[PDB]
Amino acid sequence: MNVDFINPFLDSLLNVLKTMANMELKPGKPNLKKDNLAKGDVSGLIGMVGPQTKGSLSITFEETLILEIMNKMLGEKPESIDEEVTDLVGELTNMVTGGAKNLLSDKGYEFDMATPIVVSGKNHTIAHKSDGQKIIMPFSSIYGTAYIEICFEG
Amino acid sequence: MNVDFINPFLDSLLNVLKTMANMELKPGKPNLKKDNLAKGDVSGLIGMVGPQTKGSLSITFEETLILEIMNKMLGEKPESIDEEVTDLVGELTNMVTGGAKNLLSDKGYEFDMATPIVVSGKNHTIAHKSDGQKIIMPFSSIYGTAYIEICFEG
């Protein structure tokens, strides 16, 4: 996959966490050829469609990380992933994906995003089922790890 | 929402399950108000975008049900949910959505679909984060329960 397409999602993530949670996550080594390995506790998932193109984005969080994000964004920690946390994950998925859509639209890449889906489950794995090009990127802090996966056809 | 919009998704689910494994599931009473309640072990998730509209579909299976579906097609149960099983759930998800896409095009409802995502994890729940109308319908059998959620706004 081309880097100028990938970066805006990676940059939106870091920008959203920086401006909203005063949090600088550390990007790790990307994986360009295998998903359904990295475990998470809550995930935001969103589909994308463009002219002759289709794709998908997922942002997966370990429980300790998302609860600390809640704590910085709303001043209080819920103890466990509850309904309000799933809403935060939905909103974060929208901000990461929307911020990427604006930057990419200036570069000539146009797409519409679907409704986000939040999955809650202890140690679930995500797999983007497509013959397209994929990228998985870990982002770590002392409070846990987040995984962003972007997939596209066309 | 519209029963004319929802029905094509429900019919495709039964048609795809019959075509694949001769599996007939019984529909139960749907929830039209609240999601993030039904639990499952493997789910297919796919976004939808039409002109000035956006939506999402998820199909969730209990482990015993999806492994029996596998058993009816191949002659043997896989023991756990693996890549073969997640590949099947992604295909079932595309076929259900594509089948509905066609029935709905004849009626005037048009949309394109994103790439499907498959989630694996014991007892995970699903929240479609939208202001639109939602339907979560159970489909039961002697081998366990499947849930289909359709969400759309526009």
Verbal overview:
Two copies of one chain form a homodimer. The first copy, chain A, is an alpha+beta fold. In chain A, strands 1, 2, 3, 4, 5, 6 and 7 form a seven-stranded antiparallel beta sheet that branches. Chain A has a single domain (about 1-154), classed as Chemotaxis protein chec, CATH 3.40.1550. Chain A is about 35% helix and about 35% strand. Chain A has helices spanning about 5-20, 65-75, 85-105, and strands at about 25, 40-50, 55-60, 110-115, 115-130, 135-140, 145-154. The interface of A and B includes residues 46 and 83 of A.
- The CATH topology of chain A is given as Chemotaxis protein chec
Largest sheet of chain A: 7 strands, antiparallel
Which CATH C-level class of chain A is it? Alpha Beta
Largest protein-protein interface: A-B, 41 and 42 residues
Question: Using DSSP, what is the number of strands of chain A?
Answer: 7
The CATH architecture name of chain A reads 3-Layer(aba) Sandwich
Query: What is the molecular shape of chain A?
Result: globular
Give the C-alpha Rg of chain A.
Answer: 15 Å
Helix content range of chain A: 25-40%
**Strand share of the residues of chain A?**
35-45%
- Helix count, DSSP H or I runs of 4 or more residues of chain A: 3
State the end-to-end distance of chain A: 11 Å
Q: What oligomerization state is this entry in? A: homodimer
Q: How many domains make up the coordinates of chain A?
A: 1
What's the CATH superfamily of chain A, by name?
Answer: CheC-like
